[PDB]
Amino acid sequence: TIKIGAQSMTESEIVANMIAQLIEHDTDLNTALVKNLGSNYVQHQAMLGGDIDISATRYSGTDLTSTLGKEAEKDPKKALNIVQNEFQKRFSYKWFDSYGFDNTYAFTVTKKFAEKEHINTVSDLKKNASQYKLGVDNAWLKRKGDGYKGFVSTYGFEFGTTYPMQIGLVYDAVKNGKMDAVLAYSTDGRIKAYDLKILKDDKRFFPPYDCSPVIPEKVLKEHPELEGVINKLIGQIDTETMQELNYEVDGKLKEPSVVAKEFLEKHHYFD
Numbered sequence: 378t379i380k381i382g383a384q385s386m387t388e389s390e391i392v393a394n395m396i397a398q399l400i401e402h403d404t405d406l407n408t409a410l411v412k413n414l415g416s417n418y419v420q421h422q423a424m425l426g427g428d429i430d431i432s433a434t435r436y437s438g439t440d441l442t443s444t445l446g447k448e449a450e451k452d453p454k455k456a457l458n459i460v461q462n463e464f465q466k467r468f469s470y471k472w473f474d475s476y477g478f479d480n481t482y483a484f485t486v487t488k489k490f491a492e493k494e495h496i497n498t499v500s501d502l503k504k505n506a507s508q509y510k511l512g513v514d515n516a517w518l519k520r521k522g523d524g525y526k527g528f529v530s531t532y533g534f535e536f537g538t539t540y541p542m543q544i545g546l547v548y549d550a551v552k553n554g555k556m557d558a559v560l561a562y563s564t565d566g567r568i569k570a571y572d573l574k575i576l577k578d579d580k581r582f583f584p585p586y587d588c589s590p591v592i593p594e595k596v597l598k599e600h601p602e603l604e605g606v607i608n609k610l611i612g613q614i615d616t617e618t619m620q621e622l623n624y625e626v627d628g629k630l631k632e633p634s635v636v637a638k639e640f641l642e643k644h645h646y647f648d
């Protein structure tokens with residue numbers, strides 16, 4: 378039975394279910410979901426411990442700056458290449474090419490706030506930063522490399538008050554005027570659904586966050602038919618598609634298993 382890890386994100390659950398169903402459609406392997414993994418660190422430790430055989434969703438800039446303890450590379454291709462080579466060298470883990478989307482931190486505001494405050498870029502926030510409330514996830518404030526400390530030293534300012542919360546809550550918090558700005562995830566469907574504005578990262582502070590599955594070479598060796606299944610999804614999901622899938626769960630309240638199934642059926646399980 379292949380143990381598939383899902384991080385505590387709607388996106389991770391959708392993709393974990395998608396992998397599970399594709400594996401069972403194509404092969405005689407049974408699968409199990411290991412859900413609610415709190416962070417990439419928890420995912421990685423679970424893989425080191427053999428608690429999971431597959432990480433459904435890992436993000437290049439995230440593991441680059443934490444797991445690998447490296448500078449935040451700003452080029453998508455170079456960042457992916459470093460992560461892939463390092464995962465092979467250090468762990469004999471295969472970090473696959475991307476599904477096709479980058480899920481980045483994105484400073485997000487209502488269009489009303491942007492018009493009132495004259496905001497197009499992250500640097501535009503500087504003039505009144507002390508007046509703003511910023512909603513962020515439960516980890517970003519303490520992250521090294523791509524975290525708040527790095528943000529401050531690059532952009533040269535702090536927000537008046539920063540509020541860490543479950544990432545799922547930031548979209549309503551900003552829509553409802555509770556926060557002036559939130560550090561959202563760019564693949565969340567509620568950004569488009571709520572007509573929000575993503576601010577340009579004008580100093581290119583954030584590294585890329587291309588999303589890929591990760592699987593130990595040992596697992597791929599034990600189950601030679603596994604790589605071919607995973608290959609079917611590589612390059613097949615762009616951001617717009619990911620946003621739509623995310624919204625199926627977060628806006629329409631559908632089970633990730635159901636959303637995954639419907640996606641696979643539409644694409645005839647990629648043959």
Ligand SMILES: CC1=N[C@H](C(=O)O)CCN1
Pocket residue numbers: 416417436439480481482562586
């Ligand atoms: C920028 C980003 N952060 C998440 C995290 O830090 O695990 C993963 C998906 N996107």
